[PDB]
């Protein structure tokens, strides 16, 4: 657009810089300083995915501001949208596999303590990242972001396939959080119930209201509504603001609350 979309661009550049410094601190602390468990492997991979996504959002911010003020008319390449899509899908799939591993920890505690393979988690991590590549480049080369051209009749099909993948990740996160909540609300003795309940509803509403809108508008709404050309300048900058709020408040919730809280 013109000046109508300008203040979401400044908002995504403030929350993008906050997300870069948060995910940089989480990446440095879990890479080079602290001792890691399987959960720190999941938090580290989630911070890497959000670091890639917020890097590509802040360079989209910078090329839009270079288009507006300096009038350079720089063109970012088309594969940055592809690797940003891969970062977004991996950053949501880490949230789903965090909720699945917590459900397996509470429902099956003897197995999760004593018989869990220590090289499971990273293996699960790399397979989810592998599937992110299988949903990114097979997206992008059909949508013209790779190989300069592509059939849109296939591109819409692969957008619907990854939309089914996003609603599958949401029902896996919601079903696992529901199973963990009924397992604690039936059978808890010494657990901190209200803090655990509030953090579970916080992570579910972050995955619903913040992480999911950009994927639903980018892969699903844009093909099924068929008149979204005037709906763009309202729904798309607020969706990248909400997804950058998801990627920026994933270091603060999953690390600096779980593990940097007392200080």
């Amino acid at each position: 657009c013109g000046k109508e979309t300008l203040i979401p661009v400044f908002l995504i550049l403030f929350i993008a810089l906050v997300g870069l410094v948060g995910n940089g601190f989480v990446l440095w602390l879990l890479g080079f300083r602290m001792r890691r468990n399987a959960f720190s492997v999941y938090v580290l991979s989630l911070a890497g995915a959000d670091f890639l996504f917020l890097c590509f959002q802040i360079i989209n911010c910078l090329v839009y501001l270079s288009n507006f003020f300096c009038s350079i008319s720089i063109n970012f390449p088309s594969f940055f949208t592809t690797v940003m899509t891969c970062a977004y899908l991996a950053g949501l799939s880490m949230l789903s596999t965090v909720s699945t591993e917590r459900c397996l920890s509470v429902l099956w505690p003897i197995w999760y303590r004593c018989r869990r393979p220590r090289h499971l988690s990273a293996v699960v991590c790399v397979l989810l990242w592998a599937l992110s590549l299988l949903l990114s480049i097979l997206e992008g080369k059909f949508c013209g972001f790779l190989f300069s051209d592509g059939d849109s009749g296939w591109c819409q099909t692969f957008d619907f396939i990854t939309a089914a993948w996003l609603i599958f990740l949401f029902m896996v996160l919601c079903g696992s959080s529901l199973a963990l909540l009924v397992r604690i609300l039936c059978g808890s003795r010494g657990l901190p119930l209200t803090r655990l309940y509030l953090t579970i509803l916080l992570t579910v509403l972050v995955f619903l209201l913040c992480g999911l809108p950009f994927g639903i508008q980018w892969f699903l709404i844009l093909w099924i509504w068929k008149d979204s050309d005037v709906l763009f300048c309202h729904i798309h900058p607020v969706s990248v603001v909400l997804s950058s709020l998801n990627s920026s408040a994933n270091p603060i919730i999953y690390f600096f609350v779980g593990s940097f809280r007392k200080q």
């Binding site: 989209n60 949208t81 949508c143 013209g144 051209d149 592509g150 849109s152 591109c155 980018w218 844009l222 763009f232 798309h236």
Partner: peptide, 5 residues
């Protein structure tokens, strides 16, 4: 080629 940017 698709476009919403």
């Amino acid at each position: 080629f698709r476009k919403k940017w």
